[PDB]
Amino acid sequence: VLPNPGLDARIPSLAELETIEQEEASSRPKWDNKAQYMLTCLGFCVGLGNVWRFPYLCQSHGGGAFMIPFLILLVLEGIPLLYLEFAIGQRLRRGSLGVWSSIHPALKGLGLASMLTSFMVGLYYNTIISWIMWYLFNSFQEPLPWSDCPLNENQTGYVDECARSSPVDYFWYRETLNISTSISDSGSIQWWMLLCLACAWSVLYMCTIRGIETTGKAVYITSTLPYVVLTIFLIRGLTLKGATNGIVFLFTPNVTELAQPDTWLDAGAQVFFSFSLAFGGLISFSSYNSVHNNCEKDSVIVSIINGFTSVYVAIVVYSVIGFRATQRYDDCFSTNILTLINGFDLPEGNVTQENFVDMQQRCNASDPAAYAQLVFQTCDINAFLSEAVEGTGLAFIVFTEAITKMPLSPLWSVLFFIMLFCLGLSSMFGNMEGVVVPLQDLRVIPPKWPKEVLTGLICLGTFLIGFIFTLNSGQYWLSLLDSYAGSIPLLIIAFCEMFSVVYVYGVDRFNKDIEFMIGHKPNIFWQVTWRVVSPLLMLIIFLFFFVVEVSQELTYSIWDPGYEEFPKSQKISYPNWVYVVVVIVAGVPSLTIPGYAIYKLIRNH
Ligand SMILES: *[C@@H]1O[C@H](CO)[C@@H](O[C@@H]2O[C@H](CO)[C@@H](O)[C@H](O)[C@H]2NC(C)=O)[C@H](O)[C@H]1NC(C)=O
Ligand SMILES: *[C@@H]1O[C@H](CO)[C@@H](O)[C@H](O)[C@H]1NC(C)=O
Ligand SMILES: *[C@@H]1O[C@H](CO)[C@@H](O)[C@H](O)[C@H]1NC(C)=O
Ligand SMILES: *[C@@H]1O[C@H](CO)[C@@H](O)[C@H](O)[C@H]1NC(C)=O
Ligand SMILES: *[C@@H]1O[C@H](CO)[C@@H](O)[C@H](O)[C@H]1NC(C)=O
Ligand code: MET
């Protein structure tokens, strides 16, 4: 165990903390019910990262190789680190920065890396909400806007790119975003998304005006709504035409795929983002309730209420992906049948889906010169499932075309998008708490000002920085920041704290501490998973990320309607300067830990 001098006289004495609890009646807020606490920590570690990043990170890796590693890494790392951070948040009685500043005070960097990364994530995790509510505004009309192609100035046919692609892709790629051909090409500001950005950053600031005592009621409402609308959509999904053909595709593991470092790294970077570990949000939430609270129970139940709603959203999403795939397959087959009969004049009900191959052999032996002119298609299932589906285009290109092929669609669409909105709002509640708490714990604003002014300043600042995603070339910036800021700094912060708690604070002190708090030493499981397995797994994930960054080309997809075979996605490389951004997003917020450590150890000569 590292020396760590002066650990006492900086933290409460373990024998007088229940006396300190009385001073917490006025200087700190407190939860009204236990239910509010469990719901807020349940509404913070769920949503938009189980529907918008999970199925993409599943499909890219086939679809079956991202469910075994995810669950192993869950049961091995998501639970123990979460229990650890709950227990600290309750013992040390301070926010997300005052804790890591009491353990070996040269470790205040974590209080800054966590703040910076919870800011960088919230920078775009709000413009996603902006797009969602822009879609929600376009409902409330009986013919859905994305159900037809608009005609040109010369009313004879559809516009070009609406004809060569789906009618729903000419609502996301040309009417909503108006995407330009390349990231180096950026144009106007696109007011009609400034409106939605302002509305999103206003709803958020209208809900979290005072930290707690104002997220309470919004947690009562917007953390139970998704758990009934999700079931309503599951019941409708499993009775579709193409169900049981997608959810069976989800669970067939391509065994030679989970033997690649890429899938392991993706599961590792996703199990920390499905929760909110290393964000600095759960420390502060678990720093309010009373002392003699059974910190274990809550931890375990939350760990098993989220990891369950992670395969309960994968089922509902793949139950729609399979439906869309089998629909396109039947359409291709009907088109082939039609191209055959229009060419040979056969009756209507003699070429059906089972005697097709024999009937096609039965014509080529009768008109060999008339047959070898028809351009047949090719279409087989298990090739329409693994298609070009990416984030920002999984919950807006799939669910919005399968929502218009059901009766009374102007209701299902509104229900689905209110589900997504009230599923993504909670997360931002927690994140804004995790960015506001360490700021006023830094004495950055004179303490005589109210809390509303600081929340308003943060909201205005992040809104004004959020003009970068509303340009034409806007979806590319978002894809880039999403990838890198969700991948790299999270796991390094998590490892650094998981090491600092068990090897700088002592594990035995923490042990008898939790013993006095709840009333029993933790089982052997927690001991073994805290002392050896958790840091060892982390190192592996780290090296895998470092071996999955070199030797893998850095490419992004463009739209470019002028390029031939246009329905397919064209893939190019970023310009050279982009690495600069890749630093300022994956650097400073994950390098201020050793930087501050060196600054503090070289201040003391
Ligand atoms: C199952 O995963 C393997 C990887 O282990 C896939 O094999 C790759 O397939 C792509 C096809 O685009 C090739 O470019 C790679 O060279 C293959 N790699 C290896 C190591 O064989 C395989 O395609 C996957 N299964 C299916 C049905 O696609
Ligand atoms: C439609 O008609 C107008 C006038 O007849 C013509 O100028 C225009 O070019 C036509 N549209 C196209 C796409 O050619
Ligand atoms: C979409 O962007 C193009 C730039 O390529 C611009 O000319 C056009 O005006 C934009 N759409 C609308 C409706 O303004
Ligand atoms: C379709 O027509 C062919 C020729 O008229 C006939 O042999 C075949 O039996 C018909 N289909 C069925 C299902 O009877
Ligand atoms: C059609 O029959 C000819 C033999 O007359 C053969 O050479 C050709 O490959 C056949 N085409 C198909 C599609 O079977
Ligand atoms: C500011 S956290 C962003 C979303 C949330 N943490 C989640 O994992 O769903």
XYZ file of C-alpha atoms and ligand atoms in Angstrom:
698
model
C 0.000 0.000 0.000
C 1.320 3.416 -0.968
C 2.352 5.602 1.999
C -0.189 8.442 1.685
C 0.794 10.630 4.662
C -1.726 12.719 6.555
C -4.777 10.696 5.532
C -6.337 11.462 8.905
C -7.490 14.957 9.933
C -8.749 15.342 6.362
C -11.734 12.953 6.443
C -14.327 12.337 9.180
C -13.129 10.076 11.990
C -15.496 7.036 11.489
C -16.640 7.426 15.100
C -18.288 10.852 14.878
C -19.816 10.817 11.386
C -23.333 10.214 12.703
C -22.802 13.429 14.656
C -21.714 15.191 11.449
C -25.006 14.075 9.881
C -26.866 16.772 11.845
C -24.867 19.530 10.133
C -26.164 18.188 6.798
C -29.681 19.538 7.396
C -29.055 22.995 5.905
C -25.784 23.098 3.942
C -26.696 20.170 1.670
C -29.983 18.992 0.163
C -31.446 15.604 0.977
C -33.711 13.103 -0.722
C -37.343 12.998 0.317
C -37.963 9.278 -0.263
C -35.705 6.361 -1.008
C -37.678 5.835 -4.203
C -36.513 9.188 -5.533
C -32.911 8.103 -5.015
C -33.253 4.721 -6.704
C -35.219 6.242 -9.571
C -32.746 9.061 -10.195
C -29.790 6.694 -10.221
C -31.901 4.435 -12.451
C -32.857 7.204 -14.864
C -29.233 8.297 -15.113
C -27.677 4.952 -16.082
C -30.072 4.112 -18.946
C -31.234 5.359 -22.322
C -29.673 6.594 -25.572
C -26.732 4.245 -25.495
C -28.943 1.205 -25.292
C -31.058 2.166 -28.317
C -28.711 4.374 -30.360
C -25.187 2.977 -29.835
C -25.837 -0.642 -28.854
C -27.430 -2.012 -32.058
C -24.869 -0.272 -34.281
C -21.920 -1.514 -32.236
C -23.677 -4.877 -32.486
C -24.260 -4.943 -36.247
C -20.759 -3.761 -37.145
C -19.416 -6.741 -35.189
C -21.835 -9.106 -36.894
C -24.478 -9.070 -34.185
C -23.792 -12.173 -32.154
C -20.268 -11.431 -30.975
C -21.375 -8.359 -28.984
C -23.670 -10.056 -26.443
C -21.375 -12.606 -24.771
C -18.433 -10.208 -24.228
C -20.795 -7.454 -23.131
C -22.339 -9.611 -20.415
C -19.057 -11.070 -19.184
C -17.634 -7.568 -18.884
C -20.847 -6.441 -17.184
C -20.826 -9.067 -14.439
C -17.074 -8.623 -13.994
C -16.602 -4.841 -14.041
C -19.873 -2.936 -14.077
C -21.004 -4.152 -10.663
C -17.877 -3.936 -8.458
C -16.766 -0.490 -9.565
C -20.328 0.773 -9.186
C -20.601 -0.549 -5.636
C -17.232 1.014 -4.848
C -18.258 4.442 -6.040
C -21.596 4.318 -4.223
C -19.832 3.404 -0.979
C -17.310 6.230 -1.290
C -19.944 8.802 -2.169
C -21.654 7.970 1.109
C -18.599 7.761 3.349
C -16.621 10.830 2.318
C -19.739 13.044 2.362
C -18.639 15.277 -0.523
C -19.132 15.781 -4.233
C -17.255 14.311 -7.184
C -14.215 16.556 -6.658
C -13.937 16.926 -2.889
C -13.382 13.177 -2.649
C -10.385 12.673 -4.931
C -8.897 15.788 -3.326
C -8.868 14.200 0.145
C -7.121 10.988 -0.922
C -3.474 11.996 -1.453
C -4.227 15.610 -2.403
C -2.085 15.449 -5.542
C -4.935 13.437 -7.089
C -7.296 16.356 -7.690
C -6.919 15.727 -11.408
C -9.733 13.185 -11.393
C -12.051 15.932 -10.203
C -11.110 17.780 -13.395
C -10.911 14.945 -15.904
C -14.369 13.808 -14.806
C -15.763 17.323 -15.166
C -14.188 17.874 -18.585
C -15.411 14.548 -19.943
C -18.916 14.986 -18.543
C -18.897 18.306 -20.360
C -17.609 16.921 -23.670
C -20.245 14.184 -23.657
C -23.081 16.537 -22.757
C -21.943 18.801 -25.583
C -23.513 16.473 -28.174
C -25.688 14.176 -26.090
C -27.984 17.200 -26.136
C -27.989 17.854 -29.861
C -29.128 14.252 -30.263
C -32.124 15.169 -28.103
C -32.520 18.186 -30.378
C -32.855 15.999 -33.470
C -35.272 13.693 -31.655
C -37.581 16.515 -30.697
C -37.336 17.916 -34.220
C -38.757 14.604 -35.373
C -41.360 14.791 -32.610
C -42.522 18.165 -33.895
C -42.999 16.834 -37.429
C -45.666 14.398 -36.254
C -49.253 15.544 -35.616
C -50.273 15.247 -39.263
C -52.237 12.420 -40.828
C -49.984 11.839 -43.873
C -46.549 11.504 -42.298
C -43.995 13.829 -43.948
C -41.462 11.093 -44.436
C -43.899 8.795 -46.236
C -43.761 10.350 -49.730
C -41.244 11.934 -52.092
C -41.745 15.611 -52.985
C -41.960 16.601 -56.628
C -39.621 19.020 -58.393
C -40.461 22.363 -60.004
C -41.535 20.415 -63.112
C -44.332 18.163 -61.857
C -43.592 15.016 -63.837
C -41.491 12.844 -61.505
C -39.823 12.745 -58.126
C -36.590 14.498 -57.271
C -33.541 12.482 -58.277
C -32.103 11.417 -54.929
C -35.562 10.621 -53.551
C -36.081 8.143 -56.395
C -32.738 6.315 -56.243
C -33.077 5.845 -52.464
C -35.857 5.344 -49.968
C -38.506 8.022 -49.399
C -37.436 8.233 -45.758
C -33.790 8.936 -46.573
C -34.918 12.082 -48.340
C -36.140 13.365 -45.028
C -33.122 12.699 -42.809
C -30.272 13.391 -45.211
C -31.697 16.315 -47.217
C -34.596 17.991 -45.376
C -33.543 17.686 -41.733
C -29.748 17.967 -41.916
C -29.102 19.046 -45.522
C -25.776 17.225 -45.414
C -22.929 18.492 -47.580
C -20.515 16.216 -49.390
C -17.459 16.481 -47.148
C -16.399 17.452 -43.642
C -14.040 20.070 -45.049
C -17.099 21.758 -46.608
C -19.322 23.660 -44.185
C -21.887 26.285 -45.078
C -24.816 28.078 -43.465
C -26.234 27.725 -39.946
C -29.582 25.993 -40.705
C -31.881 28.004 -38.450
C -34.534 25.278 -38.275
C -32.202 23.354 -36.011
C -31.228 26.377 -33.940
C -34.891 26.441 -32.993
C -34.719 22.867 -31.723
C -31.384 23.426 -29.956
C -32.840 26.403 -28.116
C -35.903 24.379 -27.166
C -33.803 21.479 -25.847
C -31.418 23.621 -23.812
C -34.423 25.511 -22.490
C -36.368 22.445 -21.350
C -33.261 21.166 -19.608
C -32.660 24.453 -17.788
C -36.324 24.682 -16.873
C -36.149 21.256 -15.227
C -32.850 21.466 -13.320
C -33.125 25.041 -12.067
C -31.921 24.124 -8.568
C -30.229 20.722 -8.653
C -32.215 18.505 -6.324
C -35.670 19.628 -5.154
C -36.417 20.184 -8.836
C -35.225 16.994 -10.503
C -37.419 15.085 -8.063
C -40.722 15.451 -9.848
C -39.235 15.160 -13.322
C -37.673 11.908 -12.144
C -41.046 10.698 -10.883
C -42.511 11.239 -14.352
C -39.710 10.800 -16.902
C -38.146 7.637 -15.488
C -41.266 5.447 -15.428
C -42.783 6.471 -18.779
C -40.259 4.555 -20.939
C -40.805 1.333 -19.002
C -44.416 1.070 -20.189
C -44.085 2.487 -23.697
C -41.215 0.060 -24.212
C -43.490 -2.858 -23.320
C -46.240 -1.486 -25.557
C -43.735 -1.479 -28.398
C -42.458 -4.958 -27.547
C -45.954 -6.448 -27.734
C -46.397 -4.798 -31.122
C -42.947 -5.849 -32.303
C -43.056 -9.562 -31.577
C -46.342 -9.955 -33.463
C -45.013 -8.394 -36.665
C -44.227 -10.276 -39.862
C -40.445 -10.381 -39.555
C -40.015 -10.994 -35.861
C -38.335 -14.234 -34.750
C -36.151 -13.729 -37.823
C -34.244 -10.802 -36.356
C -34.096 -11.679 -32.675
C -32.709 -15.051 -33.709
C -30.057 -13.252 -35.743
C -29.028 -11.371 -32.608
C -28.065 -14.513 -30.687
C -26.057 -16.562 -33.212
C -22.395 -15.974 -32.302
C -19.915 -15.904 -35.154
C -17.340 -17.700 -33.024
C -14.424 -16.500 -35.115
C -15.446 -12.902 -34.357
C -15.109 -12.663 -30.570
C -11.424 -13.561 -31.066
C -10.569 -10.057 -32.300
C -9.420 -7.231 -29.998
C -11.906 -4.844 -31.595
C -15.030 -6.504 -30.173
C -13.541 -6.787 -26.699
C -12.557 -3.110 -26.732
C -16.024 -2.102 -27.889
C -17.712 -4.131 -25.154
C -15.338 -2.630 -22.606
C -15.981 0.943 -23.683
C -19.723 0.274 -23.800
C -20.175 -1.338 -20.386
C -18.881 1.889 -18.807
C -21.135 4.077 -20.951
C -24.323 2.083 -20.405
C -23.802 2.900 -16.751
C -22.358 6.296 -15.914
C -19.153 5.173 -14.251
C -16.220 7.584 -14.497
C -18.634 10.447 -15.241
C -18.751 11.794 -11.703
C -22.502 11.779 -11.457
C -23.225 8.858 -9.167
C -20.693 9.897 -6.519
C -22.611 13.118 -5.955
C -26.033 11.446 -5.972
C -24.894 8.921 -3.393
C -23.447 11.733 -1.272
C -26.777 12.977 0.063
C -28.733 10.219 1.798
C -28.329 9.271 5.446
C -25.361 7.332 6.783
C -26.806 4.014 7.996
C -28.184 3.229 4.554
C -27.692 -0.229 3.073
C -25.449 0.894 0.215
C -25.120 -2.701 -1.039
C -28.728 -3.546 -1.872
C -29.202 -0.460 -4.002
C -25.956 -1.092 -5.865
C -26.811 -4.695 -6.714
C -30.403 -3.969 -7.745
C -29.386 -1.081 -10.001
C -26.668 -3.239 -11.518
C -29.280 -5.884 -12.314
C -32.069 -3.543 -13.451
C -29.906 -1.930 -16.120
C -28.079 -4.991 -17.439
C -31.552 -6.446 -17.914
C -32.978 -3.419 -19.722
C -29.921 -3.710 -21.974
C -31.072 -6.962 -23.587
C -34.705 -5.830 -23.339
C -34.062 -2.961 -25.766
C -31.885 -5.018 -28.081
C -34.835 -7.386 -28.503
C -37.268 -4.592 -29.373
C -34.873 -2.951 -31.834
C -33.922 -6.143 -33.633
C -37.579 -7.163 -33.762
C -38.014 -4.173 -36.090
C -34.774 -4.542 -38.017
C -35.763 -8.108 -38.872
C -39.186 -6.928 -40.007
C -37.726 -4.320 -42.350
C -35.251 -6.844 -43.748
C -37.863 -9.496 -44.484
C -40.078 -6.827 -46.055
C -37.341 -5.785 -48.465
C -36.697 -9.463 -49.207
C -40.319 -10.121 -50.155
C -40.231 -7.001 -52.323
C -37.152 -8.205 -54.212
C -38.738 -11.610 -54.732
C -41.988 -10.117 -56.009
C -40.000 -7.941 -58.406
C -38.185 -10.988 -59.773
C -41.474 -12.838 -60.272
C -42.910 -9.826 -62.066
C -39.873 -9.461 -64.332
C -40.221 -13.109 -65.317
C -43.924 -13.131 -66.112
C -43.907 -9.766 -67.907
C -41.262 -11.322 -70.121
C -42.763 -14.712 -70.869
C -46.548 -14.247 -70.472
C -47.372 -16.811 -67.813
C -50.612 -16.759 -65.803
C -50.718 -14.954 -62.467
C -50.730 -17.642 -59.793
C -48.257 -20.181 -61.175
C -44.958 -18.557 -60.199
C -44.948 -18.365 -56.404
C -42.154 -18.286 -53.844
C -41.445 -22.045 -53.853
C -41.655 -23.338 -57.436
C -39.764 -20.337 -58.795
C -36.434 -21.974 -59.605
C -38.013 -24.875 -61.446
C -40.281 -22.513 -63.384
C -37.271 -20.395 -64.357
C -35.509 -23.517 -65.601
C -38.722 -24.336 -67.475
C -38.490 -21.221 -69.661
C -34.784 -21.082 -70.559
C -35.317 -24.401 -72.337
C -38.025 -22.841 -74.532
C -36.850 -19.358 -75.652
C -33.059 -19.246 -75.218
C -32.636 -15.977 -77.133
C -35.581 -14.234 -75.478
C -34.480 -15.291 -72.005
C -30.899 -14.050 -71.941
C -31.969 -10.404 -71.853
C -33.837 -9.981 -68.551
C -31.729 -8.465 -65.772
C -32.537 -10.551 -62.718
C -31.893 -9.420 -59.178
C -30.152 -11.333 -56.419
C -31.531 -11.417 -52.884
C -31.166 -13.906 -50.044
C -31.846 -13.437 -46.359
C -28.919 -13.167 -43.920
C -27.621 -10.578 -46.374
C -30.364 -7.993 -45.839
C -29.841 -8.084 -42.070
C -26.168 -7.036 -42.000
C -26.670 -3.837 -43.994
C -25.394 -0.248 -43.777
C -26.852 0.810 -40.434
C -24.972 3.333 -38.320
C -25.658 5.521 -35.337
C -27.579 8.677 -36.113
C -29.524 6.713 -38.663
C -30.535 3.639 -36.713
C -33.385 5.151 -34.716
C -34.240 7.594 -37.522
C -33.971 5.432 -40.654
C -35.271 2.069 -39.408
C -37.915 2.870 -36.796
C -39.356 5.725 -38.852
C -40.040 3.601 -41.925
C -41.461 0.682 -39.957
C -43.663 3.110 -38.015
C -45.539 4.207 -41.155
C -46.494 0.661 -42.230
C -48.855 0.137 -39.276
C -52.407 1.406 -38.746
C -52.868 4.688 -36.882
C -49.243 5.703 -37.363
C -49.667 9.356 -36.216
C -50.042 7.784 -32.765
C -47.271 5.187 -32.747
C -44.781 7.778 -33.974
C -45.641 10.240 -31.213
C -45.502 7.510 -28.575
C -42.120 6.279 -29.787
C -40.546 9.706 -29.875
C -41.896 10.735 -26.479
C -40.368 7.490 -25.225
C -37.010 8.454 -26.719
C -37.231 12.021 -25.400
C -38.169 11.104 -21.827
C -35.585 8.324 -21.987
C -32.816 10.721 -22.939
C -33.741 13.603 -20.659
C -32.935 11.848 -17.384
C -29.398 11.086 -18.494
C -28.855 14.785 -19.101
C -30.277 15.530 -15.650
C -27.543 13.440 -14.104
C -24.827 14.804 -16.372
C -25.722 18.423 -15.640
C -25.614 17.623 -11.939
C -22.172 16.097 -12.438
C -20.899 19.224 -14.178
C -22.507 21.747 -11.810
C -21.416 20.122 -8.537
C -17.605 20.251 -8.993
C -17.770 23.829 -10.255
C -19.137 25.534 -7.147
C -16.933 23.214 -5.077
C -13.990 24.993 -6.730
C -14.851 28.529 -5.515
C -15.116 29.725 -9.121
C -18.145 31.952 -8.480
C -18.422 34.246 -5.433
C -20.516 32.268 -2.940
C -23.080 35.052 -2.512
C -24.710 34.384 -5.883
C -27.690 31.999 -6.201
C -27.496 28.612 -7.926
C -29.836 29.616 -10.745
C -27.266 32.053 -12.150
C -24.544 29.422 -12.380
C -26.833 26.860 -13.992
C -27.946 29.507 -16.474
C -24.393 30.488 -17.341
C -23.389 26.873 -17.970
C -26.462 26.342 -20.134
C -25.814 29.475 -22.196
C -22.148 28.616 -22.660
C -22.790 25.077 -23.814
C -25.562 26.287 -26.115
C -23.251 28.825 -27.743
C -20.598 26.155 -28.226
C -23.291 23.901 -29.677
C -23.393 25.846 -32.925
C -20.799 23.489 -34.384
C -23.260 20.644 -34.973
C -25.955 22.722 -36.653
C -23.932 23.555 -39.770
C -24.447 21.693 -43.020
C -21.559 19.272 -42.496
C -22.898 18.580 -39.050
C -23.405 14.855 -38.715
C -19.696 14.170 -39.274
C -18.506 16.288 -36.344
C -21.005 14.446 -34.187
C -19.863 11.025 -35.366
C -16.238 11.945 -34.651
C -16.784 13.349 -31.158
C -19.132 10.488 -30.295
C -16.584 7.841 -31.250
C -13.512 9.241 -29.552
C -14.931 10.957 -26.455
C -17.075 7.938 -25.689
C -14.235 5.500 -26.214
C -10.976 6.587 -24.676
C -11.148 8.774 -21.522
C -13.855 6.800 -19.748
C -11.866 3.620 -19.217
C -8.683 5.400 -18.156
C -10.564 7.440 -15.550
C -12.341 4.304 -14.347
C -9.085 2.384 -14.002
C -7.345 5.268 -12.258
C -10.068 5.575 -9.634
C -10.423 1.802 -9.180
C -6.697 1.735 -8.486
C -6.652 4.808 -6.247
C -9.386 3.521 -3.951
C -7.930 0.075 -3.282
C -4.245 0.984 -3.267
C -4.008 4.591 -2.046
C -6.812 4.630 0.548
C -6.038 1.117 1.755
C -8.516 -1.671 1.125
C -8.751 -2.764 4.762
C -9.691 0.692 6.021
C -12.428 0.857 3.384
C -13.406 -2.670 4.381
C -14.021 -2.013 8.069
C -15.545 1.316 7.038
C -18.279 -0.306 4.964
C -18.590 -2.831 7.787
C -19.523 -0.093 10.228
C -21.783 1.563 7.665
C -24.069 -1.243 6.541
C -23.387 -3.940 9.134
C -21.382 -6.774 7.574
C -18.086 -7.284 5.807
C -18.535 -7.741 2.047
C -18.548 -11.283 0.721
C -15.419 -12.848 -0.764
C -16.707 -12.022 -4.243
C -16.297 -8.287 -3.755
C -12.823 -8.826 -2.306
C -11.474 -10.887 -5.201
C -13.111 -8.679 -7.795
C -11.700 -5.528 -6.218
C -8.148 -6.667 -5.597
C -6.939 -8.497 -8.720
C -9.491 -9.095 -11.460
C -10.743 -5.547 -11.989
C -7.389 -3.778 -12.556
C -6.084 -6.699 -14.607
C -9.082 -6.602 -16.921
C -8.653 -2.839 -17.311
C -5.038 -3.164 -18.411
C -6.102 -5.623 -21.086
C -8.829 -3.327 -22.408
C -6.294 -0.461 -22.462
C -3.684 -2.346 -24.466
C -6.385 -3.587 -26.825
C -7.456 -0.028 -27.501
C -3.817 0.829 -28.187
C -3.522 -2.132 -30.564
C -6.814 -1.324 -32.265
C -5.889 2.273 -33.088
C -2.777 1.673 -35.159
C -3.199 -0.843 -37.999
C -6.844 0.175 -38.525
C -7.561 2.856 -41.110
C -9.550 5.901 -39.994
C -12.476 6.256 -42.392
C -15.887 7.918 -42.355
C -18.886 7.658 -44.660
C -20.197 10.394 -46.941
C -23.486 10.999 -48.721
C -22.465 12.491 -52.102
C -25.506 12.030 -54.377
C -23.437 12.715 -57.496
C -21.354 9.572 -57.033
C -22.410 6.515 -59.030
C -23.986 3.469 -57.368
C -25.371 6.149 -55.083
C -27.613 4.012 -52.798
C -24.447 2.408 -51.423
C -22.397 4.251 -48.835
C -19.098 5.721 -49.991
C -16.227 5.598 -47.510
C -13.323 8.060 -47.450
C -10.643 9.286 -45.054
C -10.583 12.355 -42.828
C -8.272 15.192 -43.782
C -4.922 15.468 -42.021
C -5.747 18.228 -39.544
C -8.484 16.267 -37.748
C -5.941 14.592 -35.471
C -5.748 17.956 -33.715
C -9.374 17.617 -32.628
C -8.783 13.954 -31.779
C -6.300 15.243 -29.224
C -8.316 18.120 -27.740
C -11.153 15.641 -27.119
C -9.188 12.482 -26.245
C -6.195 14.270 -24.729
C -6.630 16.997 -22.105
C -9.699 15.368 -20.450
C -7.684 12.141 -20.157
C -4.209 13.601 -19.615
C -4.898 16.164 -16.888
C -4.436 13.314 -14.390
C -0.672 12.802 -14.874
C -0.301 16.478 -15.703
C -1.747 17.618 -12.396
C 0.109 14.870 -10.540
C 3.417 16.088 -11.969
C 2.481 19.700 -11.264
C 1.793 18.900 -7.613
C 4.896 16.744 -7.175
C 7.085 19.421 -8.759
C 5.509 22.266 -6.794
C 6.932 20.643 -3.642
C 10.672 20.758 -4.337
C -17.513 -13.992 -39.265
O -16.352 -13.297 -38.832
C -15.227 -13.469 -39.700
C -14.047 -12.807 -39.027
O -13.389 -13.705 -38.142
C -15.548 -12.883 -41.069
O -14.447 -13.144 -41.933
C -14.083 -11.934 -42.613
O -14.979 -11.661 -43.686
C -14.668 -10.463 -44.414
C -15.747 -10.297 -45.457
O -15.902 -8.934 -45.827
C -13.267 -10.562 -45.018
O -12.939 -9.328 -45.644
C -12.245 -10.883 -43.935
O -10.970 -11.112 -44.523
C -12.675 -12.121 -43.157
N -11.731 -12.409 -42.091
C -11.356 -13.651 -41.772
C -10.372 -13.773 -40.649
O -11.793 -14.633 -42.363
C -16.808 -13.530 -41.630
O -17.191 -12.870 -42.830
C -17.958 -13.456 -40.625
N -19.109 -14.195 -41.114
C -19.903 -13.752 -42.094
C -21.043 -14.645 -42.472
O -19.709 -12.677 -42.651
C -40.067 21.585 -66.658
O -40.654 22.459 -67.630
C -40.032 23.747 -67.727
C -40.829 24.534 -68.741
O -41.453 23.674 -69.687
C -38.567 23.588 -68.118
O -37.945 24.868 -68.130
C -37.856 22.670 -67.133
O -36.522 22.434 -67.569
C -38.596 21.342 -67.010
N -37.954 20.491 -66.020
C -36.865 19.761 -66.277
C -36.338 18.943 -65.136
O -36.326 19.762 -67.379
C -29.511 22.973 -48.432
O -28.123 23.223 -48.628
C -27.819 23.753 -49.923
C -26.313 23.803 -50.036
O -25.803 22.640 -50.673
C -28.478 25.118 -50.070
O -28.206 25.632 -51.368
C -29.981 24.987 -49.868
O -30.574 26.281 -49.872
C -30.295 24.285 -48.545
N -31.722 24.036 -48.429
C -32.622 24.992 -48.173
C -34.050 24.545 -48.091
O -32.299 26.165 -48.017
C -49.499 -22.894 -63.897
O -49.612 -23.099 -65.300
C -48.957 -24.267 -65.810
C -49.205 -24.272 -67.299
O -50.505 -23.782 -67.600
C -49.500 -25.517 -65.124
O -48.763 -26.654 -65.561
C -49.397 -25.379 -63.613
O -50.014 -26.499 -62.988
C -50.082 -24.096 -63.155
N -49.964 -23.935 -61.714
C -50.641 -24.681 -60.831
C -50.392 -24.375 -59.387
O -51.412 -25.568 -61.184
C -30.373 -22.270 -71.067
O -30.155 -23.439 -71.896
C -28.918 -23.417 -72.630
C -28.873 -24.682 -73.452
O -29.746 -24.601 -74.569
C -27.740 -23.299 -71.671
O -26.532 -23.206 -72.417
C -27.909 -22.075 -70.781
O -26.846 -21.992 -69.841
C -29.245 -22.148 -70.056
N -29.428 -20.992 -69.194
C -29.712 -21.099 -67.895
C -29.864 -19.813 -67.146
O -29.836 -22.186 -67.348
C -24.137 12.467 -19.544
S -24.257 10.681 -19.600
C -24.978 10.442 -21.233
C -26.026 9.339 -21.274
C -26.000 8.368 -20.090
N -24.771 8.513 -19.321
C -26.165 6.940 -20.589
O -25.196 6.144 -20.400
O -27.257 6.639 -21.162
